[PDB]
Design an enzyme around this catalytic site. Structure first.
Site, PDB file in Angstrom:
ATOM      1  N   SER A 175       0.893  -0.752  -0.165  1.00  0.00           N
ATOM      2  CA  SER A 175      -0.292   0.243   0.596  1.00  0.00           C
ATOM      3  C   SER A 175       0.989   1.134   0.007  1.00  0.00           C
ATOM      4  O   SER A 175       1.796   1.400   0.496  1.00  0.00           O
ATOM      5  CB  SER A 175      -0.658  -0.209   1.345  1.00  0.00           C
ATOM      6  OG  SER A 175      -0.434  -0.013   2.410  1.00  0.00           O
ATOM      7  N   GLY A 176       0.486   1.864  -0.684  1.00  0.00           N
ATOM      8  CA  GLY A 176       1.504   3.367  -0.717  1.00  0.00           C
ATOM      9  C   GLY A 176       2.376   3.206  -2.293  1.00  0.00           C
ATOM     10  O   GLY A 176       2.682   4.038  -2.510  1.00  0.00           O
ATOM     11  N   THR A 180      -3.434   4.075  -6.993  1.00  0.00           N
ATOM     12  CA  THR A 180      -4.207   4.252  -7.926  1.00  0.00           C
ATOM     13  C   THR A 180      -3.566   5.079  -9.503  1.00  0.00           C
ATOM     14  O   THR A 180      -4.459   5.352 -10.148  1.00  0.00           O
ATOM     15  CB  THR A 180      -5.199   5.433  -6.942  1.00  0.00           C
ATOM     16  OG1 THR A 180      -5.624   5.109  -5.042  1.00  0.00           O
ATOM     17  CG2 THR A 180      -6.149   6.154  -7.494  1.00  0.00           C
ATOM     18  N   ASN A 215       0.666   3.776   5.596  1.00  0.00           N
ATOM     19  CA  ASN A 215       0.843   4.377   4.332  1.00  0.00           C
ATOM     20  C   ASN A 215      -1.085   5.456   4.447  1.00  0.00           C
ATOM     21  O   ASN A 215      -1.265   4.602   5.920  1.00  0.00           O
ATOM     22  CB  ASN A 215      -0.272   3.483   3.109  1.00  0.00           C
ATOM     23  CG  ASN A 215      -0.587   4.948   1.744  1.00  0.00           C
ATOM     24  OD1 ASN A 215       0.164   5.887   1.738  1.00  0.00           O
ATOM     25  ND2 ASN A 215      -1.217   4.074   1.293  1.00  0.00           N
ATOM     26  N   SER A 218      -4.077   4.164   1.760  1.00  0.00           N
ATOM     27  CA  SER A 218      -4.456   2.894   1.918  1.00  0.00           C
ATOM     28  C   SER A 218      -5.644   2.141   1.610  1.00  0.00           C
ATOM     29  O   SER A 218      -6.391   2.833   2.201  1.00  0.00           O
ATOM     30  CB  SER A 218      -3.758   1.608   2.890  1.00  0.00           C
ATOM     31  OG  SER A 218      -4.488   2.368   4.325  1.00  0.00           O
ATOM     32  N   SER A 219      -6.367   2.090   0.095  1.00  0.00           N
ATOM     33  CA  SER A 219      -7.168   1.341  -0.132  1.00  0.00           C
ATOM     34  C   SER A 219      -6.901  -0.174   0.515  1.00  0.00           C
ATOM     35  O   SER A 219      -7.325  -0.515  -0.006  1.00  0.00           O
ATOM     36  CB  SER A 219      -7.390   1.443  -1.334  1.00  0.00           C
ATOM     37  OG  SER A 219      -7.136   2.561  -2.145  1.00  0.00           O
ATOM     38  N   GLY A 441      -1.431  -6.500  -1.330  1.00  0.00           N
ATOM     39  CA  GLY A 441      -0.358  -6.980  -0.835  1.00  0.00           C
ATOM     40  C   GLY A 441      -0.272  -7.875   0.160  1.00  0.00           C
ATOM     41  O   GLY A 441      -0.939  -7.536   1.187  1.00  0.00           O
ATOM     42  N   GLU A 443       0.659  -7.802   3.201  1.00  0.00           N
ATOM     43  CA  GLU A 443       1.428  -6.339   3.995  1.00  0.00           C
ATOM     44  C   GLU A 443       1.552  -7.182   5.890  1.00  0.00           C
ATOM     45  O   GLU A 443       0.901  -7.922   6.250  1.00  0.00           O
ATOM     46  CB  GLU A 443      -0.061  -4.967   4.283  1.00  0.00           C
ATOM     47  CG  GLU A 443      -1.252  -5.818   5.135  1.00  0.00           C
ATOM     48  CD  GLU A 443      -2.060  -4.556   5.489  1.00  0.00           C
ATOM     49  OE1 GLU A 443      -1.683  -4.113   6.254  1.00  0.00           O
ATOM     50  OE2 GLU A 443      -3.037  -4.522   5.652  1.00  0.00           O
TER      51      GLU A 443
END
Ligand SMILES: Nc1ncnc2c1ncn2[C@@H]1O[C@H](COP(=O)(O)OP(=O)(O)O)[C@@H](O)[C@H]1O
Ligand SMILES: [Mg+2]
Length: 734
Positions: A175-176, A180, A215, A218-219, A441, A443
């Site tokens: 994430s990060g 996007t 992050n 993060s989504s 992924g 994390e």
């Protein structure tokens, strides 16, 4: 390459400086890789070999002594900075890291590693998105075209044209790393409806993101976008679907984590109308649902995000009254963290005390406060053909109201997604859409918990799917050539963790059955886990105490390595008792609650977050099985925003999690080196200078062991390294 099409000037990396760089002095007999103490992977040169211990001199400059057993081979300088690392003849764990870091220093964003397409995250404008490059990439295949997502997109388009089947592009990573932006560029490339996607993106990014430790944007949820195409290969319409929303974030927050951005944005004081109609005191500490986490953080200005989101909401398919209704619903969700529910004297029944916030919530939903309180305190269940009431103490009603809040939040998000989708599409016929997916992924933090376990399980399932697809492709190639080499499916090599997690008597099943036990605590949960799995399964093992971590309870050997989790809090955050009389009250409101709760057989009490997560994951997997996948790996090079410096341990961990090294090792386990017979005969005969039978005689006359190669009809199977040695000696004989 970048010539003949006016690509990026630095994208060529051929016939300009490679000729003068392949002659750099790098003695492989004295240059190896040594494990560092800080970056744990640093290149060094050995002055001399002193037996077991050898002195290593590194670029930074060190004179430490290192045992010879762990220092290992270093890639030749002539093969360095190669475009594709899939046919690298010296596979090393730090080799990929060094190649990626050198390419990034040379501004090589895109690198091929087999089916994977590793894409690092730079912080600058890249002219690679020029429409001229887009036009040039049209009609080019994987090999001829330079490394870029356009090549795999064109491959998928050709598969649509010829194979006539669905293709899906999968993007995953830490994430990060720029999920996007990457998916925005991807959808823009298929665009060249794009403006609608761009305008709708902030709403989803605000309603489904939270500030994690690593992050700040993060989504958590997974986003799937389908690009419908016509019969003549033309864009038809677009529709999006979300999966795996985390109700845990809605209900609970960690000590160094925030809730979803919507609440914090609403808490901003630049929109007094929402605060006035929502009865908000503008203090985040006044609400238990939000205050238990991080109240506010720097490096963000939620006012601008609120302006972007409400601007997107205003000029869109829908009006603003439903936006006000959604703001009312989220304010009520904030308000549910205020009732007391004191237990009655000499009885186990629970009665409310603070009949003020309940009145506010009832007014916000248009419900009756007395009816809502009666339904919460005294739920009614239908037995046989009659109805009876149930007693509920403070804990049961607290769990029920938390479940109601998280459920209404998830249903509101789903309704918003459906409304955006219904605005998005157009009535052109749709045939064989193209799917785009982005999910975080593997994390890994120092305080892994239930949410991290769920994310790890989802990524585990995705890795299982990728391995199965790779095995299917390899078996298809074997059947094409008629010879099967190591015809063992790789699914069983990975099914152990899934069985430990998903199968009955697993961790999830034990947690689910412990949620329903009369008197169950976290210590009992850990005790049952140890009694059921410690020693029975190889994957399960005792926790480890390294680097002074806070505390761990049990450890699993995941696909990326050993991960240790924490037990405390799982039972509270897994229970999802959905009250039914309150739902019936919701269905009679004068608001959007009817649309949200239109439809509502396992019992209401026997509902858990883990079960819903498992069923959603199964639905996602059965949806993805019908489409041909396309895997894209995205990583972040630097923790900060400076492209100059990139941390070696972080990239090593991300590469290990993403399985790029694992994927290339799986590819090279068989016979990945395949060449055409006639081309081999007419090119590689110069190895020892002086159709099937001629090729066989030529290869047998070059002093080659018969066990290393395998003869076929069209593609010859060669073991890894044979072709490299054959070609490197051929150049010497020139
Ligand atoms: N190809 C790219 N070029 C430049 N910047 C990028 C690129 N990809 C990502 N970024 C940077 O990443 C940041 C946001 O990353 P984002 O995609 O929001 O992460 P997440 O996937 O965790 O939401 C942006 O500020 C943007 O500058
Ligand atoms: Mg994102």
């Amino acid at each position: 390459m970048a010539v003949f099409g006016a690509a990026a000037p630095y994208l060529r990396k051929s016939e300009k400086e490679r000729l003068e760089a392949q002659t750099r002095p790098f003695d492989l007999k004295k240059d190896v890789f040594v494990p560092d103490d800080k970056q744990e992977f640093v290149k060094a040169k050995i002055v001399s070999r002193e037996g077991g211990k050898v002195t290593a001199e590194t670029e930074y400059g060190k004179t430490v002594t290192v045992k010879e057993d762990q220092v290992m081979q270093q890639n030749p300088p002539k093969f360095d900075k190669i475009e594709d690392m899939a046919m690298l003849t010296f596979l090393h764990e730090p080799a990929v890291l060094y190649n990626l870091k050198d390419r990034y220093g040379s501004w090589m964003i895109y690198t091929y590693s087999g089916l994977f397409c590793v894409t690092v995250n730079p912080y600058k404008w890249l002219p690679v998105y020029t429409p001229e490059v887009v036009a040039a990439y049209r009609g080019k295949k994987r090999s001829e075209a330079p490394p870029h997502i356009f090549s795999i997109s064109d491959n998928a388009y050709q598969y649509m044209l010829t194979d006539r089947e669905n293709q899906s592009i999968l993007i995953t990573g830490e994430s990060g790393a720029g999920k996007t932006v990457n998916t925005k560029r991807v959808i823009q490339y298929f665009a060249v409806l794009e403006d609608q996607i761009i305008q709708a993106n902030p709403a989803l990014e605000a309603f489904g993101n939270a500030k994690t430790v690593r992050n700040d944007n993060s989504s958590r949820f997974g986003k799937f976008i389908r690009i419908h195409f016509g019969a003549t290969g033309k864009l038809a319409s677009a529709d999006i679907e979300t999966y795996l929303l985390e109700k845990s974030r809605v209900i609970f927050q960690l000590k160094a984590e925030r809730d979803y951005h919507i609440f914090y944005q609403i808490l901003s004081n630049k929109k007094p109308e929402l605060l006035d109609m929502l009865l908000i005191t503008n203090n985040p500490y006044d609400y238990a649902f939000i205050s238990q986490g991080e109240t506010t953080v720097a490096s963000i200005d939620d006012a601008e995000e609120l302006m972007a989101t409400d601007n997107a909401f205003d000029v869109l398919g829908f009006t603003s009254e439903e936006k006000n209704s959604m703001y009312k619903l989220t304010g009520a969700i904030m308000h549910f963290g205020n009732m007391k529910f004191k237990l009655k004297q000499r009885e186990e029944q629970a009665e409310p005390d603070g009949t003020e916030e309940a009145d506010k919530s009832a007014y916000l939903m248009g419900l009756n406060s007395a009816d809502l309180l009666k339904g919460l305190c005294h739920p009614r269940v239908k037995v046989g053909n009659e109805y009876v009431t149930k007693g509920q103490n403070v804990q049961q009603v607290i769990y029920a109201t938390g479940a109601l809040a998280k459920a209404v939040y998830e249903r509101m998000f789903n309704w918003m997604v459906t409304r955006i989708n219904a605005t998005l599409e157009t009535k052109q016929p749709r045939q064989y859409f193209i799917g785009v997916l982005d999910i975080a992924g593997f994390e890994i933090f120092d305080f892994n918990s239930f949410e991290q376990l769920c994310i790890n399980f989802t990524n585990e399932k995705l890795q299982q799917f990728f391995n199965h697809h790779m095995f299917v492709l390899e078996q298809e190639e074997y059947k094409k050539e008629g010879i099967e080499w190591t015809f063992i499916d790789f699914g069983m090599d990975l099914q152990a963790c899934i069985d430990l997690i998903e199968k009955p008597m697993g961790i999830m099943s034990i947690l689910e059955e412990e949620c329903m036990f009369p008197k169950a605590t976290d210590m009992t949960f850990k005790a049952k886990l140890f009694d059921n799995h410690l020693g029975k399964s190889a994957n399960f093992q005792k926790p480890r105490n390294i680097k002074g971590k806070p505390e761990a309870h049990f450890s699993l050997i995941h696909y990326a390595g050993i991960v240790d989790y924490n037990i405390i809090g799982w039972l509270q955050k897994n229970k999802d008792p959905l009250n039914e009389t309150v739902v019936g009250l919701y269905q009679k409101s004068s608001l959007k609650l009817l649309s949200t709760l239109f439809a509502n057989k396992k019992g209401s009490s026997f509902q858990t977050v883990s079960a819903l997560h498992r069923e959603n994951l199964n639905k996602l997997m059965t949806n993805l099985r019908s489409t041909h996948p396309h895997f894209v790996r995205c990583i972040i090079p630097n923790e900060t925003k400076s492209p100059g410096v990139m941390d070696n341990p972080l990239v090593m961990h991300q590469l290990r999690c993403n399985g790029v090294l694992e994927g290339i090792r799986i590819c090279r386990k068989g016979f990945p080196n395949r060449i055409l017979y006639g081309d081999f005969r007419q090119r590689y005969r110069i190895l020892n200078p002086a159709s099937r039978k001629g090729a066989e005689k030529l290869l047998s006359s070059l002093d080659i062991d018969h066990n290393q190669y395998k003869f076929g009809h069209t593609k010859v199977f060669f073991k890894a390294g044979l072709l490299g040695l054959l070609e490197e000696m051929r150049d010497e004989r020139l």
